[PDB]
């Protein structure tokens, strides 16, 4: 298939990016350090809520470092106009780049949370290996999906711009807005209104931020204190179940990939 | 009959940036599109590749549609400037393009030696010069026996030993039966290797045909200079009897601007009377013909 | 040392009631008979500067309306103004003016003594080290000292091992200690006002006592100091603007930067509905004093709310209701009085400053501001502190500012 | 003088940088938004402004001048400029004047709108103390930016490509703002038997972000030593940048 | 008075000498072409004429002075190859910047903007410029002041053939005034009509210098005489093979003779004397073939 033949390039081109391997080893040496400090103090719902915030700062960062120069980095490099004269479509050299860069994030978090589990089973004596594999299996198949959202965000902001220096400004803008501005605008809206703006609409704004849907998935079982959540304490007021919370994260991929294809179709 | 463009008048933005070009290309000729870097030449280049839609007209590449995958395996496109993938190597870039075009994987090792790049194989494209990337850009164009090359300035940033060797590699493929289109702007020198030029300007294809037709359909002076003549003062007059202005700049530097309508009697004028030293018969080059037709269009 | 019968008292009523007219007197005086003596307002009974001026040795003496001046200063021989013997049970000392360099009201071994409504101006020139005590109480059971006015004495109302007695509504201004407590089990004090004092309330080793409604206006370095108090009740106290300073003698405590409440080894006590306002430290919790009901206070305007140098967690909310914090940047979705997120008053970088004072040079760095944000993002590095689930949203002490 | 003729270029080229004008606008809003929460909610708000200008004025200086030398070598204009009547000293010092007056203007839009939000929202601010504490603030924020300007000329002249120049400009910003003080704390909280704490007021002099805060928090040395050590960080690193630029 | 007198330089980096015993003498109005590979043979000899490098075993005398004087560089234009200027600056402000550095008057900016044909695209940013649009700007800073030496390193890359012919018409206007310039180019057909004397040089040495008539005379290269239907191709192809010259019968009814250009005066007499010359093209051996010969003369 032609979708895999261009995936084998990006799987072998993203792994030679030295800026990726720096901040993907930084994700590995921090997920062990949080889990080592989480083992000497004991707690259990605090070491889950800190890993999900660690992958909130880094799995959008590795996704936006990969794919900000996916379309416009090939357009000004000349190799995009050449590629359309190969037997391909615009839907195959985009979905092929998404599978190729998606297996890197599926491997960058399998390295990160993989050694984090071995720094718990060899550190916390008497831990439940069934509960460890299930909780960190929920961390593995949902930090990819958070990564695949910001991968699909970067294909939107690469097809729209026409210069790679302006694509790096927008990719830094998307990383600042979704990670640590939308969590602070919702915080500043709740303090200044003292929770009396809307008592039923305000938990639904967590679903308009995929990092907040990511944090709500992993903190489903390990609730604990309220300040362990903080802004995520609104998620107990959401009447939606857990299975739809998986489905709105998959729907955040498919809308922002169909937007990435409809932009690229009129490039 | 490789490229049969007929009646295409491309409109976009209701501007009509190309108009009614009838560009039939034979099955062994080397055509040259010689417009500016504006919407005349590069619009018709995108039509043959199939990545543009010909409004009000039909483009038939190799007897089929221009965007079919069965004919797009038989094309080869060398673009203008391709800094390909700076972190990939040389072999892995060409093996990537070999997997896409359906070419056999044994062709990459015999194309990195056919083009002079086996010393720089398994080396990263960030460590390549501009000429080495044009060598790599040619290597994906000859991939899997292409019946239609389309080179858009292949000899920029290249040494003249490689430039003379590239046109011999072009002349190997011309005898094999592959039609080549040379969209270029380094027009002195390319006239020895092309078969038919196609000067298009302001959308309208002004002149097409071989170099003998473009000199026949445009009266241009042959530039005979006879440095080292015996007598020059009557030779100011002995050429202008048939309308050839004997203009000189030294003791004997008589650069006779002729008319190319009296070629029998002017060489007999030179060799019948007066002894020369170093004759230089300069035919009207591709710059002067292009400066006539573009000036005739405006 | 003459006696009270050696004066000229004009009897208004024949129920052992006397009335001294206006006119000066001289020397010490001694009460040996149960005489309910009153005085005209010009009865300035001025001693010469030695001895206890009005010694009382008889039970049921209603001293009223005197104006005392210039008694002794021999603190070893207890040169008081009004000395009350253990046999002088149920003495009433009502509405008196005192000015002299020794003890104002020295009682010992007494029962049901009443020191009411007096104005005891201590000194002006002595260095607050030999001024003598204002109202000294030494092991009295039943006493009722109410609504007096002590000014510029040494260590205010000293109380030593006195069991059951009330201190109601008395104003204490510009003294070393406001109210001193020594082993006063099952005591009580209501609505007292201490102003401009080097320690507002000394609570040393006294259990089971009630401290309620009291006010501390602009005192120095210690608002309420509690040492080793058990089963007490701290309800409704208003401690305002504890500025830095030093006590000048440094005997049992040291100089401080200003703490509105300093809890030292107090195990069980209910500290509710108080108001700690505009000090440098709102509350200092030592490591030995843990697990006591601290709920409903108002920690407003303090530059640092809690000082807790420990790593043990300390919940500060009994029955699901917590304290009001001025810097609580929280919301209230479900419309109750409580906030929705818990409030940690201390970071990890707020306890490195207490452990190492050289971090004050690094306290304005962005890396420190990074370290304040990583604790809010990564709670594994958060040391277990002094948080309270459900803090209050509004002021509970709407009446204490009056 | 040709040190000014190349400085007018860098003023005209620096003020049209889209990356700079985004951050310099973001610097001026956050200097108002800290001043909004310090008046409605003056040494308490001038300390939070010192932590702000320690974040962004190294970032503004490193965004301007990381591509001053190596951005001209990759553009080919550096090879052209050396064939002009120009020394290598006048190119570097002329870029330092040109990039220097940009962030000498970015604190006048930065703190010129922050001091306007203090002088008109306190109503009794006692402005005689304001115009000397902000006059000391705007001067000392330029000198912090001129250190990181001269740091950017050191890393621009050393590298040969623009991609690895931004990898060093991020590394100097991480090391001199928030890695040097975190390893100062690790020498405090983990070492006490072999760490003299009297040495630490002299070890604060090895960090220009740290010397920046010490002249906004007013200590064994006086104030005038800290002014002469911040200017020594400019003059050494510019002389270091000139020594690197002469070896291309 | 020679402009550039490269007097026996020998430039070395470590142990390798990248330019050995180069001995050039550019005249006062000559247009010289420094031809060779893109390695250190040509691009270091271009820097010694500038003030950028130093001769390790020689001296250069540009305009009778040292190459690093400020009086030299005020009358010395230099257009470098692949230049990309400050993209947020405008086209007029870049020339107004470069006129202040060279000491040129500011009234020469709008003259040179009209002269290179950049009047329509002036006051637009350099980021919205083409490749050939920047070559007009890079040429325009080289004409600033009154230059007496130009080093046009690849001036006609990405330029239209009207503008390419506009540039060489500006060169012959310039060299009549007395500005002797130096080409360092690689598109060898086209430059050969304007080069006064070529300077083809190898890896290390300087192979050949002299005019095009001197290179064709020294390097024996055969003339490419082409004809078409003199009498008959097949009856005349046989005649040169017994008489000893190679006559290629190629295209169709066409007699192409690759003659040794020592006899081609009288070789054309027999070709003229028996048939009509009605479509012939005698081509001298070009600079492309001369450079291919001198690369095989050493290497
Ligand atoms: Mg609530």
UniProtKB/Swiss-Prot annotation, chain A:
InterPro entries: ABC2_NosY/YtrC-like. One of its GO terms (molecular function) is ABC-type transporter activity. The chain crosses the membrane at residues 19-39, 48-68, 104-124, 139-159, 172-192, 244-264. One of its GO terms (cellular component) is plasma membrane. The keyword Cytoplasm does not apply. Required for the assembly of the copper chromophores of nitrous oxide reductase. Could be part of the ABC transporter complex NosDFY. PANTHER family: ABC TRANSPORTER PERMEASE, ABC TRANSPORTER PERMEASE PROTEIN NOSY-RELATED. The complex may be composed of an ATP-binding protein (NosF), a transmembrane protein (NosY) and a solute-binding protein (NosD). This is Probable ABC transporter permease protein NosY. The lineage of its organism: Bacteria, Pseudomonadati, Pseudomonadota, Gammaproteobacteria, Pseudomonadales.
Swiss-Prot record, chain B:
Optimum pH is 8.0-8.5. InterPro entries: AAA+_ATPase, ABC_transporter-like_ATP-bd, ABC_transporter-like_CS, ABC_Transporter_VariousFunc, P-loop_NTPase. It is found in: Cell inner membrane. Required for the assembly of the copper chromophores of nitrous oxide reductase. Has ATPase activity. Could be part of the ABC transporter complex NosDFY. Transmembrane segments: none annotated. It is a peripheral membrane protein. Residues 3-227 form the ABC transporter domain. The gene is nosF. PANTHER family: ABC TRANSPORTER ATP-BINDING PROTEIN ALBC-RELATED. Induction: Induced in response to denitrifying conditions. Activation requires NosR and DnrD regulators. Inhibited by AMP-PNP. Partially inhibited by N-ethylmaleimide, orthovanadate and NaN(3). GO terms for molecular function: ATP binding; ATP hydrolysis activity. Keywords: ATP-binding, Cell inner membrane, Cell membrane, Hydrolase, Membrane, Nucleotide-binding, Transport. One of its GO terms (cellular component) is plasma membrane. Gene3D superfamilies: P-loop containing nucleotide triphosphate hydrolases. This is Probable ABC transporter ATP-binding protein NosF. Pfam families: ABC_tran. Belongs to the ABC transporter superfamily. The complex may be composed of an ATP-binding protein (NosF), a transmembrane protein (NosY) and a solute-binding protein (NosD).
From Swiss-Prot, chain C:
Pfam families: NosD. SMART domains: CASH, PbH1. It is found in: Periplasm. InterPro entries: Carb-bd_sugar_hydrolysis-dom, NosD_copper_fam, NosD_dom, Para_beta_helix_rpt-2, PbH1, Pectin_lyas_fold, Pectin_lyase_fold/virulence. PbH1 repeats lie at residues 58-86, 88-109, 110-139, 140-161, 162-183, 206-228, 266-287, 289-327. Keywords: Periplasm, Repeat, Signal. GO terms for cellular component: periplasmic space. Induction: Induced in response to denitrifying conditions. Activation requires NosR and DnrD regulators. It comes from the Bacteria. Disulfide bonds: none annotated. Belongs to the NosD family. Required for the assembly of the copper chromophores of nitrous oxide reductase. Could be part of the ABC transporter complex NosDFY. The complex may be composed of an ATP-binding protein (NosF), a transmembrane protein (NosY) and a solute-binding protein (NosD). This is Probable ABC transporter binding protein NosD. The lineage of its organism: Bacteria, Pseudomonadati, Pseudomonadota, Gammaproteobacteria, Pseudomonadales.
